Amino acid sequence: ERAGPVTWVMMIACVVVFIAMQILGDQEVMLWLAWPFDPTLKFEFWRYFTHALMHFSLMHILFNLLWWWYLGGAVEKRLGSGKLIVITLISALLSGYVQQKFSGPWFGGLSGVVFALMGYVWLRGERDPQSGIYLQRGLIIFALIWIVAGWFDLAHIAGLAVGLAMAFVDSLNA
Structure with a gap:
């Protein structure tokens, strides 16, 4: 009666990892979850996705999970769990x-x-x-501020481009 199962299972996953990180420290968890630092490690495929689960502070996580829950929950509500999974994996x-x-x-x-x-x-x-999915210009304003803020240290653009490409392809139906 609220946000779907993909929205929820991601939030719990990132909560579990964040806690592991608190009990074991960042380094130990990064060591097993980070993108491979060494070609010999390129067959541990979990690492191409598991980097996305790790957060380095309670604000880091809270800020991502708020967006995830709002955006991801809207995608999962209007478009289903299949669409979120795939936008998330890619x-x-x-x-x-x-x-x-x-x-x-x-x-x-x-x-x-x-x-x-x-x-x-x-x-x-x-x-x-049509599909009931939309982003307020207030939030699109927050997107671009977040990007330029990132350029001055006050992933993003790559992410941005994937979502824009997928949405384009999904909207060739007029």
Whole structure:
């Protein structure tokens, strides 16, 4: 009667990891969950996705999970659990890949997924007001501020581009 099962299972997953991180420390958990730092480790495939589960502070997590719950829960409500899973897998895969090239393999966070969900929801809403999915200009304003804020350290754009591409492809139905 609220947010769907994919919205919830992600939130719990990131909660479990964040706690493990508190009890064991960041390093120990990064060591097993981070994008491979060494080609020998390229067959531990969980790492191409599991970087997205790790958060480094209670604000880090809370801020991502608020967006995830609002955006992801809207995608799962209007479009189903299948669509969220796939936006989530592809975006984590790709924003992890771009991020790793920008700055190496020691990173974590669901914000690549979150920027895919923002691009997606906003474009789908723009091109396809039908499916009940839309992003307020207030929130699109918060997206771009968040991006330029990131450029001044006050993944993102890669995420953004995946969500915009997927939403385009999904809105070729006029």
